[PDB]
Design a protein around this ligand. Structure first.
Ligand SMILES: [Zn+2]
Length: 188
DNA sequence: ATTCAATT
């Protein structure tokens, strides 16, 4: 575990050097119809670099790297599995449609994606976000309650204490406003 | 409010 990088990433407003690779964190849980098993005790990290075992490159997208990990865990179709994904960027557009198809072909898996922030290069992919919320698995903005879990789970709070600042609130203001516009415009 | 795959 390295110094509070998760916390640093949120306040990385000025640290925006302009040369950083995207890293995704993943979690896996085992659920049995007869019994439930919590594998939350174990956790792992994922990089935007696709692993060689996945085969040839399918495109240049951080979300695709996450998609490559699902088939590598060889999940049983007869057993239910809950997987979580933590990311700090917009859901994308073409990839957003791919995640919707994945759940449709696998509704037995509980998948939730948390976006720390959403950056739209141009106004047009907003429609994908609406579809993403319906089939793009459950998406929510990172909050203090979830942040403490990610902070304690991804980084050991022992020796590495996280100091709360009014930064998460400032970030929430942008996401709460932008996300509110999409959900608020939810046409009946 | 925010940054940015292959071979021996
Ligand atoms: Zn993408």
């Amino acid at each position: 575990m390295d110094p509070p990088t998760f916390t640093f990433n949120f306040n990385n407003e000025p640290w925006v050097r302009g040369r950083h690779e995207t890293y995704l964190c993943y979690e896996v849980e085992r659920m049995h119809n007869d019994t439930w098993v919590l594998l939350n005790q174990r956790r792992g990290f994922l990089c935007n670099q696709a692993p060689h075992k996945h085969g040839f490159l399918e495109g240049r997208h951080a979300e695709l790297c996450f998609l490559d990990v699902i088939p590598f865990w060889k999940l049983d179709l007869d057993q239910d599995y809950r997987v979580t994904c933590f990311t700090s960027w917009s859901p994308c557009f073409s990839c957003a449609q791919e995640m919707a198809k994945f759940i449709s072909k696998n509704k037995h898996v509980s998948l939730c994606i948390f976006t720390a922030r959403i950056y739209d290069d141009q106004g047009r992919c907003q429609e994908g976000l609406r579809t993403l919320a319906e089939a793009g698995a459950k998406i929510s903005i990172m909050t203090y309650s979830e942040f403490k879990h990610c902070w304690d789970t991804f980084v050991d709070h022992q020796g590495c204490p996280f100091q709360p600042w009014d930064g998460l609130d400032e970030h929430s203001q942008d996401l709460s406003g932008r996300l509110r516009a999409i959900l608020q415009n939810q046409e009946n």
